[PDB]
Amino acid sequence: KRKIIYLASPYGFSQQQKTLLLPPIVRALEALGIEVWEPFARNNQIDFSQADWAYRVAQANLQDVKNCDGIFAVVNGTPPDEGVMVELGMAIALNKAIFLFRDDFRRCSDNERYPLNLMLFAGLPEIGWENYYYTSVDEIQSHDKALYKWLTGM
Amino acid sequence: KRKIIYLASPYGFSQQQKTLLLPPIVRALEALGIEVWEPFARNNQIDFSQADWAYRVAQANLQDVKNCDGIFAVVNGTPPDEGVMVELGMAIALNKAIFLFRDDFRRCSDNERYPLNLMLFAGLPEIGWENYYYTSVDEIQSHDKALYKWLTGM
Ligand SMILES: O=c1[nH]cnc2c([C@@H]3N[C@H](CO)[C@@H](O)[C@H]3O)c[nH]c12
């Protein structure tokens, strides 16, 4: 019954960011009643001693995106992380709900409407796309933004 | 008397990174007795910079690298931050002490010795550069690593 969010981020690659940045974002999402699939935590059942572990991780994440209800993509950085971008593209083509997170104040875009490369927004509505665009962790729980509307049927 | 470290990083660009990742690194360096120059706070670079102010910021950082004793460069990301790289090149050419920090486990290099672009190591010794290369915040206080040895004369 709980909506499922795939929490796509590059924060698992750095010891500090995985330890400090991810838990507050997971907590905010769970506070909304969302079930959070965080792929760095989810893929620790893989045998990383066997040579094929990379393929198995790839397919597990592909399946998690097919089975989630929405993606919450941390698109910090210049540019955003390539694996997050692949996962985001998967979610767009599978008609998943799309939520984007960027608290990076640098401006790196190819157009004047959106704050990043326009293809990151291809799965969002023409009107109101910014309602799915989160620029601070405290904003995740805002009743005026899309995550909350999604959860309240509005 | 206190040695001066320029803490170069991209962590001031993100609100969560600025608030959560930087203070533990600053206090680890200060715990060794280092005067830490953290440019985002020092040069008040807290948002996007205006039409009369960005040249002064660049000059302040250039003078800070000229006046420091060493640089502590956070070279996480793929690739490392371009401004951190500019500041690092300044410190290399000015024969400053060089310390590098990367807790990102991803390999992204053009060579087999170094985990990053070989130019980042041009101010480090040929043999034993790993003593200046920190891969965890826990490691900063290590008496077997180059920062401590630098302060105590080995
Ligand atoms: O080594 C890995 N372990 C777990 N997940 C990933 C990923 C996936 N891609 C995303 C970032 O590259 C991340 O959110 C995760 O879903 C790439 N590499 C790894």
Numbering used by the authors:
A (entry chain A), B (entry chain B): 2 to 155
Anything the authors wrote about it?
Here, we characterize the structure and function of a thermophilic dNDT, the protein from Chroococcidiopsis thermalis (CtNDT). Nucleoside 2′-deoxyribosyltransferase (dNDT) enzymes catalyze transglycosylation via a covalent 2′-deoxyribosylated enzyme intermediate with retention of configuration, having applications in the biocatalytic synthesis of 2′-deoxynucleoside analogues in a single step. The reaction catalyzed by dNDT proceeds via a ping-pong mechanism, with the formation of a 2′-deoxyribosyl-enzyme intermediate covalently linked to an active-site glutamate.13 Transglycosylation occurs in a stereospecific manner, preserving the anomeric carbon in the β configuration in the newly formed 2′-deoxyribonucleoside.
We compared two potential transition-state analogues for transglycosylation, immucillin-H (ImmH) and DADme–immucillin-H (DADmeH), as the distance between the bond being broken/formed in the nucleobase and sugar varies. Enzymes evolved to bind tightly to their cognate transition state and therefore to stable compounds that most closely mimic the charge distribution and geometry of that transition state. Based on Scheme 1 and considering 2′-deoxyribonucleside1 as a substrate, releasing nucleobase1 and generating a 2′-deoxyribosylated enzyme, ImmH would mimic an early transition state in which the distance between ribose C1′ and the nucleobase is ∼1.5 Å, while DADmeH would mimic a late transition state, since the presence of a methylene bridge between ribitol N1′ (which replaces C1′ in DADmeH) keeps the nucleobase at a distance of ∼3.0 Å from these groups. Structures were obtained with the two potential transition-state analogues ImmH and DADmeH. The structure of bound ImmH largely resembles that of the clofarabine-bound complex, in agreement with the relatively weak binding of ImmH to CtNDT, and it is therefore substrate-like. For ImmH, ΔH was −5.25 ± 0.07 kcal mol–1, −TΔS was −0.36 ± 0.14 kcal mol–1, and KD was 78.2 ± 6.6 μM, while for DADmeH, ΔH was −11.43 ± 0.29 kcal mol–1, −TΔS was 0.38 ± 0.73 kcal mol–1, and KD was 9 ± 5 nM. ΔG was −5.60 ± 0.08 for ImmH and −11.05 ± 0.42 kcal mol–1 for DADmeH; therefore, binding is determined by an enthalpic contribution. Computational studies proposed the formation of an oxocarbenium ion in the transition state for the reaction, and D62 is equivalent to a residue proposed to interact with the anomeric carbon in this putative oxocarbenium ion transition state.
